[PDB]
Amino acid sequence: GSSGSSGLIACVANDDVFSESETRAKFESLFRTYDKDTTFQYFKSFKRVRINFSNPLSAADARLRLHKTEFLGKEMKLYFAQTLHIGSSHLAPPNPDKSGPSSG
């Protein structure tokens, strides 16, 4: 699966978590602790946090180890990011180009 989806949309109610103060870290550590290549994307106003992982494994544990779990006293939620971007078969791409794929 060259291009696989391994993200998670964590919904936090603590408006503070959306600050550089520190409250944020705590939230990150929760996931970061698992994977180090995990990326975090905070969306102000949308009260959403997209956490991308390096493998479809951690993403799972990140849910059980989190979610409803009372995060600092406030219950947080987590949804499985549906795919990456719009799919569906469309106008086939133009002729390919020279390339040398490696093993996997």
Side-chain angles (χ1 to χ4, degrees), residues 39-64:
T39 84
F40 304 66
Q41 233 167 105
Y42 298 87
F43 303 97
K44 204 143 104 205
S45 210
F46 292 94
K47 308 270 164 240
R48 276 198 148 165
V49 199
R50 178 138 165 174
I51 304 134
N52 296 298
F53 303 70
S54 107
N55 53 31
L57 297 111
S58 234
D61 245 84
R63 174 183 178 198
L64 95 84

Side-chain angles (χ1 to χ4, degrees), residues 19-90:
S19 202
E20 58 118 76
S21 252
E22 240 137 44
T23 321
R24 183 159 88 192
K26 298 109 206 314
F27 166 97
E28 260 162 271
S29 180
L30 294 169
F31 315 80
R32 220 273 201 82
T33 192
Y34 320 129
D35 260 332
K36 307 234 78 118
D37 215 313
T38 27
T39 84
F40 304 66
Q41 233 167 105
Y42 298 87
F43 303 97
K44 204 143 104 205
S45 210
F46 292 94
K47 308 270 164 240
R48 276 198 148 165
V49 199
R50 178 138 165 174
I51 304 134
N52 296 298
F53 303 70
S54 107
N55 53 31
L57 297 111
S58 234
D61 245 84
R63 174 183 178 198
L64 95 84
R65 271 233 181 194
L66 316 164
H67 209 15
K68 282 158 254 247
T69 53
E70 259 170 55
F71 168 83
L72 272 117
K74 298 258 194 176
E75 171 229 55
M76 153 179 69
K77 273 168 259 136
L78 276 142
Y79 294 79
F80 246 90
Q82 224 228 306
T83 64
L84 294 154
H85 54 222
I86 185 90
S88 191
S89 279
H90 274 247

